[PDB]
């Protein structure tokens, strides 16, 4: 065995563990989610596991979807000098075209044999795994300050008397047993002798700190396009209440969509409809209020 504990400022190591674990957790959660936002009229007719596509797109490798046996299996694809042949690395096994491939972008609208590359972002300047590191430390220390604020927001009622058995019988039989009408000696024995340590310099501070945590989440959120935007259009709470500057959050949402524009180039080739929409739906009540067809009653209940 080996044991000799520090003190009870162990909490001052537990506090910094909460901050450190919050940064690690929020960082890898936020990129645990971020490669699924778009999902684009999900599997109309096309054999793509779009989850495996979007995970590949957020490590910035240019995937290439084409035909394999007329059914659109993904492949990897790493002034205008045109690409034609299957020179690139190919991830499937025997489903390779073994024939004339092409990029279907500008050779014509809708004619050439399909192997179209899809960028994550049309013009690439900085990776957004750096921006997610940029705010999560700032977010980490505001989560530190919230946790440190509510950890010292606890309150005792200090009794103050010369020690051995004068005031103990008082609080036992007449405060925590709830008793009104306790009788005492005239020796100033509650003339502000019992005192309260309060932290009312802490609870007005508490709510404003939560609002700073909240709008910093929102200021990370609208950067990476994930937004509450369309419902904010129909709710009429459009500007300076949701302090987000709508023209910037509809801006950063749009760059990721027109990065995945070459799926429309593919969609024009084989005669089908694939639009890169932007997912904001969460179900069992939204699907109920949009239909209210009695077959949807036998589906849910």
């Amino acid at each position: 065995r080996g044991l000799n504990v520090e003190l009870s400022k162990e909490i001052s190591k537990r506090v910094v563990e909460h901050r450190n674990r919050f940064k690690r957790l929020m960082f890898n959660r936020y990129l645990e989610f971020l490669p699924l936002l778009i999902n684009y009229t999900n599997r109309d007719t096309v054999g793509i596991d779009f989850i495996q596509l979007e995970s590949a797109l957020r490590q910035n490798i240019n995937v290439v979807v084409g035909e394999a046996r007329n059914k659109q299996i993904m492949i990897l694809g790493y002034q205008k000098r045109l690409t034609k042949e299957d020179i690139y690395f190919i991830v499937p096994d025997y489903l390779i075209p073994d024939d004339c491939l092409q990029i279907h972008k500008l050779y014509d609208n809708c004619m050439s044999g399909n192997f179209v590359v899809m960028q994550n972002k049309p013009i690439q300047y900085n990776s957004d795994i750096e921006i997610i590191e940029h705010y999560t430390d700032e977010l980490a220390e505001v989560a530190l300050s919230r946790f440190s604020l509510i950890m010292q927001a606890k309150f005792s009622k200090i009794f103050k008397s010369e020690i051995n058995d004068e005031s103990i019988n008082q609080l036992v039989s007449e405060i925590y047993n709830g008793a009104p009408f306790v009788k005492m000696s005239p020796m100033f024995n509650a003339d502000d002798d019992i005192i309260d340590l309060t932290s009312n310099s802490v609870i007005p501070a508490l709510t404003e700190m939560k609002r700073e945590y909240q709008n910093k989440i929102s200021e990370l959120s609208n950067y990476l396009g994930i937004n509450s935007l369309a419902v904010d259009k129909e709710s009429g709470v459009s500007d300076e209440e949701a302090k987000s500057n709508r023209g910037f959050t509809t801006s950063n949402s749009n760059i990721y969509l027109k990065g995945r524009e070459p799926i429309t180039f593919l969609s024009k080739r084989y005669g089908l409809d694939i639009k890169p929409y932007y997912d904001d739906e969460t179900t069992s009540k939204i699907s109920m209020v949009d239909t209210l067809k009695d077959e949807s009653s036998d589906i849910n209940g």
């Binding site: 034609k84 004339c100 092409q102 050779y107 809708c110 004619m111 050439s112």
Partner: peptide
């Protein structure tokens, strides 16, 4: 209608094979 598409597909196939050995 169907031919219009296959005729378009084969012309691009000829054009992307002529440029592999073209003077252009």
């Amino acid at each position: 209608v169907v031919l219009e598409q296959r005729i378009a597909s084969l012309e691009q196939q000829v054009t992307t094979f002529l440029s592999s050995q073209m003077q252009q």
